[PDB]
Amino acid sequence: HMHFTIQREALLKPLQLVAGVVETLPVLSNVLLVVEGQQLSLTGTDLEVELVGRVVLEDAAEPGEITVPARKLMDICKSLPNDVLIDIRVEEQKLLVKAGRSRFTLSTLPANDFPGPGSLNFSIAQSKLRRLIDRTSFAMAQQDVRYYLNGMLLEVNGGTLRSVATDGHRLAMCSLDAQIPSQDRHQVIVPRKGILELARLLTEQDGEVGIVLGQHHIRATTGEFTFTSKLVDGKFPDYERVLPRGGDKLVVGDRQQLREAFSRTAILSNEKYRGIRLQLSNGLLKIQANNPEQEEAEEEVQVEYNGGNLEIGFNVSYLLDVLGVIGTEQVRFILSDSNSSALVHEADNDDSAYVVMPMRL
Template identity: 50%
Template structure:
């Protein structure tokens, strides 16, 4: 097909049977991603960035009226790169150490759509990826392409105030064993009622689901727990999401009481991944 320019802002494609005409804009009007004033730049392996995004981005909100939740907080402090996502009911926080250090703390909010696209583009290789930030956009340089996105202009919630402190009931569980138990119990869950009731006693965790038809499923697993008995309920889908995100073999769950949020982390003490889930009413 032959395109011919007609005037300053239109193209037409003539043929023996049809005529197509469309309007265009000058290439000078295309956004200039290279013209942004980038104030910070870091370099890290693709695999590290992909893992950081995969292990936190699932907690982002989707089409929330609080637009600043429909994205991922990317924060730089010293030599630490941190990502935080929350939808108001759960929170995921991840961090890693970078080679370069900044003197002032800085943060941006990357839109959900850009995070999902980055998750598709990144791979598990050790090839470096360069990330540059400005006040209005982010640029990610991969070996074979450059990716840019506008940022969300808003104030992300103070996530540090959400992290539970002082919990006195600590459980260590095999991640895969717990995930399988919750998955089996979830078979009887309905779309409207996805709660799972967790009962803790010495050395034992019991997960119970009761649906609207009063059908029930109960799963028991052995855990490391020596605290007082506790009964607490959560959205089962939220627990499964974070268990799918944690790569470690064991998880630590810290509780205060049935009305307080739970803090869930890998069982080691590095605290590079932290997950907070709000309880549901019993």
């Protein structure tokens, strides 16, 4: 019975978003299409995350529910001419798609085969929530035995919203005032796949997003989309104890010059370890790398530093990841000795903080 008409572009926007989360059970590879009143809902799931896109239908629509191959329907919609009206109907377990001189018949699976209260509720600018994820996501573990590290901590304390990610070798954290009435500290761990998907969804430059923090789920709503993710059932480590406090050396350098020098020198680093050596002295940072072929790279970078000497080793990729998220022209490194972590911040604020464990030289 299900039948509706929709412009290519109106259908394409939520379809593309929904198909993006779709990846043994045949129904899992399908998009759930629901027509109720003058509203079309599009749902996609991989069992960990669920994405619901909603469209308001302008013309007359007969209600119903059906599942159809998500990738095929998205590809069909994408391939159709711009601004064409698409007519969609269900006829004998098949989805019939008509647009201009084109006709498509898709196989379907029943909607019946298709798969709690919020502890805290708040609204945030999409730009702000995306910033928390994008400034820290590179530091999340991937398939680590410590399962609670294969995702991102989202923490509310006072009126601050904080993101924390770590793989046990390096850490990234970002804090922003959001003015959330919490009274008691709440923590949630979003799985790495779900949090990276959420960041990609927050595109509204001046838009808002309603956040609901549940016991075993997180819900993000923007009016057009409903994103639901399961939570990692564990306690995030006491990261406050991992933050270096010793720091006696303040180095201020050019973000770009440092990133380029670390990257260039790494060309001649050992392919299996990717280690670089830093030799810090008054106003100067010497960057060196060597490989088993006795090839050597050396670069001297002028830095703002007045202190004693320090020789320290690092995995170049950890340094490159941190520098890739620094938004200011200058970067601050806070160091102590050869066996202690580097603490990194942007030039003018402490809202973002990065920790990198050194490598033995």
